Structure formats: C-alpha cells, structure tokens
Amino acid sequence: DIVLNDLPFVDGPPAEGQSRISWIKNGEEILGADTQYGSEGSMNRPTVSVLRNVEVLDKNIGILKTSLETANSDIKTIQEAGYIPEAPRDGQAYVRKDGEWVLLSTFL
Amino acid sequence: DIVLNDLPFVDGPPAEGQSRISWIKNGEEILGADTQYGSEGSMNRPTVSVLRNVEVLDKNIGILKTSLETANSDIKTIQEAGYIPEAPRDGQAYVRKDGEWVLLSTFL
Amino acid sequence: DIVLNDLPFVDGPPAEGQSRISWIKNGEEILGADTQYGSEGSMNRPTVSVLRNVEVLDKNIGILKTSLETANSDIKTIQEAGYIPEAPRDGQAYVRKDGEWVLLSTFL
C-alpha cells in the first residue's frame, strides 16, 4: 500500500494533523516581513500556507515516482524472463524443443 | 486510459471548464474577509484561486495512486503465477518433471 | 528512469535552476497590476511564484500519468500472452495437450 502525506493546510474544518488556513481579515494589521528572507506578516500568511501544501505535493509525487520506477523494473524483469506461451490445442501432445512446441508423435 | 481533472484557474486564456485568475489591480479596493473563516476580499482572491488548483492536484495524485496500487497488485499476481521458463535450445526434446526440464530420451 | 522538473521557486537557499521566493517586505511599495490581465505588483508577487510551482507540478503529474499508462498497457499484454503455469511436482513427466498438463506415461 502506498502511503502519502496529507496536506497540512485546508480551507475548511481540519482533520488530524491539519490546520485551517487563516485568510487576511479586515480590521487586521496589514504587514509584511522585516528581513530580506523572512515570510512573516499577514500579507504573506495565506500564500505561505499554500506553499507549504505545494511542498507536500512535490514530496508525494516523488513517492509515486519511486514506486512507479520499481513497477517498471519489475515489468522489464517479467518481459525478459523468457516464459513460454501455450501449445496448439488440437488434441495432440507436445514437447519442447529449440524454443518451439513439437509433436510428441514425431519421436514415438 | 487515466482521466485527470484539468486545473480550474489559469494565468492566461482559459480553455473549456477553466477560468482566468484575477490578479490584484491598482485602483481596486484592497479588502480582506469579514468573518473568522471567510476568504472574500481582493487581498485573498488570487491566493484562493491558486489553492483551488492545489486541491485539484491533490485529487489527481490520489487518482494516480489508486491506479498504481492496482498495477502493483497485478504485477504481484504475475510473479506468483508460477509461469515456466524456456527449456534448453540444444536440439533435444524436453518434458516437464518436478519443476525442471528433463530429456524426453531418458524415458524412451 | 523517470525525469521530473524541479520546482522553480523555493522558500530557502536555491539549488541549480531555482530562485528564492521574494515575500512582501515592510517598507516596500504595496502595488498591484496596471492591466486587466497582468500579474505585476508586490501584492501579487509571491502568489505568482507559487502558481509557477503549481504549473510545474501539473506537468510532472502528466509525466507520471504517461508512464503509468504505458505500464498498464505492458501488464495487459503479459496477462494476454497465454503463458503456461507449472505442472504437478509428483515425480512424473508431463507433456502439453489441449491447454493442460498430461502424463507422458499415457502415451508410452
């Protein structure tokens, strides 16, 4: 079973491990960040929350990619195993010789 | 064929079922929400649109996960089927005995 | 091997091909766009960056979908190949007739 991460922020009642996004409200102080790299401030808040979800989605795609790569590899192994197909269904018995089905009667 | 959902909001001319994102414009009233949980207001508008796309992406990943789980299960079934590999290609006829290829001549 | 696109914008030190997101800063001019369809302006900047990541994620999911469709098709081909299962492991030699394993002794 493949286990993916739940999104950390939702626009509605949260479930286990999630938080509700806090949109910008009127009457709230409209501020930005105080450092060249910080993300604090109400003006940035909801976008920071959406980016956190985007980071989780990126990791979930990486989990699916790894699993798909494994499937592709397993498929290639089956294709190269050299399994043999069915023999004619004509009421005659067949044996295997040189990669083909040959009539048993030919040897009796 | 796997059918995924198209993103609902795009930053360009929309196609069927899509809407163009409306960025914040100068000369527009800069407002937020009036409830503790609402997302109304120009200051929230473009971010709400991007979150809608994020919700759709999350569902699309869930669709791929289900399909991949089914593939993994089908692969496991093939690996456990016990298909048999090719017999030597040496000009001799072979029959099956105790999970191996044995020379027909040994019984004639 | 499946090759996916890296996200173009990150909230931290960037790696090859990435740029650091520029959050809204205090002391910065708070502006929007001047056209009905433009996305310029500090108020839109971080959200535009997150949308660029969302567009890349959408393409990465499309890459995984194509690869999974190919796997599904390869699996279907293996299921329809008609490979044959193992014969009884009871110390007796078997030959193939009418889609079943039959005792060689029956023909000797």
Give Cα B41 to chain centroid, integer Å: 34
Angle at C40 between CA C14 and CA C35, to 5 degrees: 160
Q: Which of B9, B19, B25 to mutate to test the interface with C (most CBs of C within 10 A)?
A: B25
Closest CA to B50 of A32, C47, A96: C47
**What are the structure tokens assigned to C82, written together?**
């008609």
- Number of compact structural domains in chain A: 1
Rounded CA gap, A32 and A19, in Å? 22
The CA-atom distances, in angstroms, between C99 and each of A90, A92, A96, A100, C21 are 9, 10, 14, 15, 65
How far away is chain B from the Cα of A95, in angstroms, using its nearest Cα? 6
DSSP letter string over chain A?
Answer: ----PPPSEESSS--TT-EE----BTTS----BSSSS---STTTHHHHHHHHHHHHHHHHHHHHHHHHHHHHHHHHHHHHS-BPBPPP-SS--EEEETTEEEEGGGG-
Put simply, whether B43 touches C (Cβ < 8 Å) is yes
Q: Does C82 touch chain A (CB under 8 A)?
A: yes
- For residue A55, what are the contacts with CB-CB under 8 A and spacing of at least 6? none
CA distance C15 to C13: 7
Using CB atoms, list chains with 3+ pairs below 8 Å to chain A.
B, C
With beta carbons less than 8 A apart as the criterion, state whether B10 and B65 touch. no
Record: contact B96-C87, CB cut-off 8 A: yes
* C86 Cβ under 8 Å from any chain B Cβ: yes
| CATH number reported for the structural domain that contains residue A62 in this entry | 1.20.5.320
Instruction: Tell the residue number behind the tokens 């795609």, with chain if given.
Output: A61
Pairwise CA distance, residues A103 & C96, whole Å: 10
- Residue C34 contacts residue C43 (beta carbons within 8 Å): no
Contact A64, C64 (CB under 8 A): yes
DSSP labels, C21-82: ----BTTS----BSSSS---STTTHHHHHHHHHHHHHHHHHHHHHHHHHHHHHHHHHHHHS-
Cβ–Cβ gap A24/B43 under 8 Å: yes
CA separation for the pair B59, B50 (Å, rounded): 15
Instruction: Tell me if B34 and A26 make a contact (CB, 8 A cut-off).
Output: yes
Integer Cα distance of B69 and C68 in angstroms: 11
Which residues contact residue A33 at a Cβ distance below 8 angstroms, ignoring those fewer than 6 apart?
A: A39, A40, A41, A44, C23, C24, C25, C26
Asked if C31 reaches chain A (Cβ–Cβ under 8 Å), the answer is no
Size of interface B-C (CB pairs under 8 A): 115
Give the helix ranges, DSSP H, for chain B: 45-80
In the block, tokens 């929400």 appear at: B33
The resolution, in angstroms to one decimal, equals: 2.0
The technique by which this structure was obtained is X-ray
Domain that holds residue A89: 1-108
Q: Is A47 on the interface with C (CB under 8 A)?
A: yes
Please list every residue in chain C whose beta carbon sits closer than 8 Å to the beta carbon of residue B27.
Answer: 32
